[PDB]
Amino acid sequence: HHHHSSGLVPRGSHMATSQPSILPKPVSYTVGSGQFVLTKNASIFVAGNNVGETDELFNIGQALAKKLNASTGYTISVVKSNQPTAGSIYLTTVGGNAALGNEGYDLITTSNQVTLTANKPEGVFRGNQTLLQLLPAGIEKNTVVSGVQWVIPHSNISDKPEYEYRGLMLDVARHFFTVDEVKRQIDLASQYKINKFHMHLSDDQGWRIEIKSWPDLIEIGSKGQVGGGPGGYYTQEQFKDIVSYAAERYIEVIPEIDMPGHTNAALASYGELNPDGKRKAMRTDTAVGYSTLMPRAEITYQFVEDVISELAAISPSPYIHLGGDESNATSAADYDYFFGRVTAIANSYGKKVVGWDPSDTSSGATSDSVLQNWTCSASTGTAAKAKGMKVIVSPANAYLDMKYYSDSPIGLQWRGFVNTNRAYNWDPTDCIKGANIYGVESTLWTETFVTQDHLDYMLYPKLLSNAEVGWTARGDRNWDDFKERLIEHTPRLQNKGIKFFADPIV
Ligand SMILES: CC(=O)N[C@@H]1[C@@H](O)[C@@H](O)[C@@H](CO)O[C@H]1O
Fold first, then answer.
1. Cα dihedral sign, 177-180-186-188
2. Which residues pair with 391 in a beta bridge?
3. CATH topology of domain 1-17+163-506
4. Is there an atom of ligand 1 within 6 Å of 56 CB?
5. Looking at the chain, which residues constitute the CATH 3.30.379.10 domain(s)?
6. Which one of 2, 114, 283, 303 has the lowest number of neighbouring Cβ atoms within 10 Å?
7. Does the annotation mark 326 as catalytic?
């Protein structure tokens, strides 16, 4: 047998009775004869195992109706009833197939009815992302589309994720993005079954979360960014609003306050956090590794506790991310000590700790701690594995801030180039052997990204590749297949208003 790898498409990128475009690829998908037609008289019916579950499904139904109404121009409403009428969409958790887990679902479309059967409301929400992809391109428009018959082929889908953790990180410290901009990225990612959003809220160039007991973190530490723009910050109310928005999409928000390194913005806000008692100058360059909290000063741990206390109060995720990357101004002994102490503080506030490697090596880590493995070397996470810690993988292939190509107008290249193909052609088991792999996280660092258009360009289509790696089983993943599916999907990216890169490899 003969095999080959993909080159660039001759003559440029392709991204430059019915055809559904399901991404990530579902466990199974078959189509039969006939079609369902969505008309102006359609209702969404919802039915759970009890009234409280029905009420939760009702909210999900209303979210679905909102999306359908925006493009069809209909006014589809939601009904609490297990007696759907011909032409209805029916969302139910009664009789879910338990083997599909919390996020799985069956989605069966007949001529008369669309029925989505799940174990839990979360699974109905994920299934709804598939439903939107079975309708014609045009359905994902934010304004009314005319001349398109709203049909769904008679079809049968069963589905469930391979990995529990499928995440996106946005760096809002290097360049600030508004609550609206962040909500938009959360919303877009949710449509591809991303279920975790990690916010990198502080770094050397900015501090982005209001801490009432240390007001100058905002008054001074939020006032810049990379390149000397004005920066910005989230009030605690705005952070809660982001969390609530994500919650409606069954997305967990994990806030990160990076320590002991990547801390210049804090050090520039409060002089007492520095050995000489003087505030650092703010930094607007892109250097890393130079900053450190004082590992042996009690003021450091009072500061960390106040931050953790306020953040824990407003962040319902059982996890807090305490960073731990590139502490090059911190000795190994001090790092080990520091990270163990802050893990004890977090645990006292009822939060488990996520940290970048090498944080798993801290003797104060517990088996409830989580390692975010970005280095992905042979020895990374040796400690985590020995300790029974869950591992989230973020290899070069998930570093979505990497240039697509040598000539990309934005992005970094310290992990080489990451085009859509590279973002696809890997498996979490490649990154670490012998570990409890919790899942994948796509990291969008923002040293070189200033506008929403820059975010869009780097995340799309790259994130789509990463999202399939998290959801779809390795045995069902194939670049030649995904590539062709991605071409088919392109008009939907257009319709959503995403300023994607038309990758020449697609
Ligand atoms: C864990 C991690 O990625 N740390 C830093 C991050 O702050 C950013 O600079 C990024 C750019 O790709 O790479 C690393 O230098």
1. negative
2. 371, 437
3. TIM Barrel (3.20.20)
4. no
5. 18-162
6. 2
7. yes
